Design a protein around this ligand. Structure first.
Ligand SMILES: C[C@H](N)[C@@H](CCCCCC(=O)O)NC(=O)O
Ligand SMILES: C[C@H](N)[C@@H](CCCCCC(=O)O)NC(=O)O
Lengths: 219, 219
């Protein structure tokens, strides 16, 4: 299976918007697809248990019909860092369960997209971050950049840290998080020049069918 | 002179609030102090030229009376990345002028605080970032962290990149950018454990006399 990890420059950069656009393009290219969000915090109660909305978006954008717990093994109600609510609830986030879940998807999908929680360095326990699991699984990384003031600095910090860990930065996606503003073209040029990986596409500001904005031929 | 560079985890983390608190504490400890903001964008017109409000805060919190242009050599009206408006206006941001200005302050002050524009990797030209000048001047760095969701990731990215450049992370300051919330203590504990430098103090949420929240004995 092709496998990719999607991370964002900041919270609220629209990372799941770009993940669904990636999933839609892969399905159009003929892949049997699966989204995976091993850890999620900020979930709703339903008759069947807690359901996180980003995870639900990945489930309905996968081309395989998949059960919710296959898409998202660890679901926490409170929208805070996973290591805080894991400790609070007495439910350890185990690396082996996170890896077993990815293997289970690879039985049935040949293009798997893995979305983390938060940014690169989100703690999962007091001695373990999301970055440690991604390095361990040796996943190529796709960076989602919300285009706004301050994103050049965040895109550059994240890009140097992934490369320092010896991982491949497979590409980046620009997500227009605000209406058109004055320095949009100059920001897109600086980001293109400075991020050492291909721009896969730009999703316009929309307050669903977004696969067309992604060029999967560059991945 | 002692010299420090202040950088923030994101835009609007209240970096100049922490710079003025640092300047107030140094003055209380008996230093002849000077703030320096070599580059600023987002300035007002006055009868004497453009004036940037952060720069004005540094000027009035310095214990020496200083002229505005000594505090802030490069002033741009538009609030965007310095390399965009520098190119637009046809006024190159020169490293030698930025360094000459720091030396000029060192003639008269023995404790100089240097504040950048934006975050670590703010471009000053197409081939030169703020990070390049700070590495060149070999300044110790103080990190200002706004405590909010998403700051663990940003504080960790910035801390690893400064250390990778071989610079000293002298310490960090926690700035409470929102009213008290649910996971404030747990966030302060995770940030203390993960940032490899002493916590110098925490400034409470206030929508001016803040020197008391800084322990200068740890610098
Ligand atoms: C306008 C902002 N306040 C700041 C410049 C921000 C540059 C951000 C660059 C980026 O996107 O990383 N200017 C200044 O502090 O003087
Ligand atoms: C609640 C957020 N949306 C996210 C967790 C953010 C963790 C941020 C940690 C930090 O401060 O760096 N959860 C999630 O995506 O499932």
């Amino acid at each position: 299976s092709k496998r990719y990890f999607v991370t964002g420059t900041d919270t609220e950069v629209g990372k799941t918007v770009a993940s669904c656009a990636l999933l839609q393009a892969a399905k159009a290219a003929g892949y049997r697809t699966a989204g995976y969000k091993p850890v999620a915090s900020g979930s709703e109660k339903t008759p069947e248990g807690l359901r996180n909305s980003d995870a639900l978006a990945l489930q309905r954008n996968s081309s395989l019909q998949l059960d919710y717990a296959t898409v998202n093994p660890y679901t926490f109600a409170e929208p805070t860092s996973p290591h805080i609510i894991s400790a609070q609830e007495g439910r350890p986030i185990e690396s082996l369960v996170m890896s077993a879940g990815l293997r289970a998807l690879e039985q049935q999908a040949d293009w798997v997209l893995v979305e983390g929680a938060g940014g690169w360095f989100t703690p999962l326990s007091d001695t373990f971050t999301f970055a440690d699991w991604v390095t361990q699984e040796q996943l190529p990384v796709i960076l989602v950049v919300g285009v706004k003031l301050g994103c050049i600095n965040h895109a550059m910090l994240t890009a140097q840290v992934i490369q320092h860990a010896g991982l491949t930065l497979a590409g980046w996606v620009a997500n227009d998080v605000t209406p058109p503003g004055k320095r949009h073209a100059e920001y897109m040029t600086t980001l293109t020049r400075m991020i050492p990986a291909p721009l896969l596409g730009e999703i316009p500001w929309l307050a669903a069918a977004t696969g067309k904005y992604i060029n999967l031929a560059l991945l």
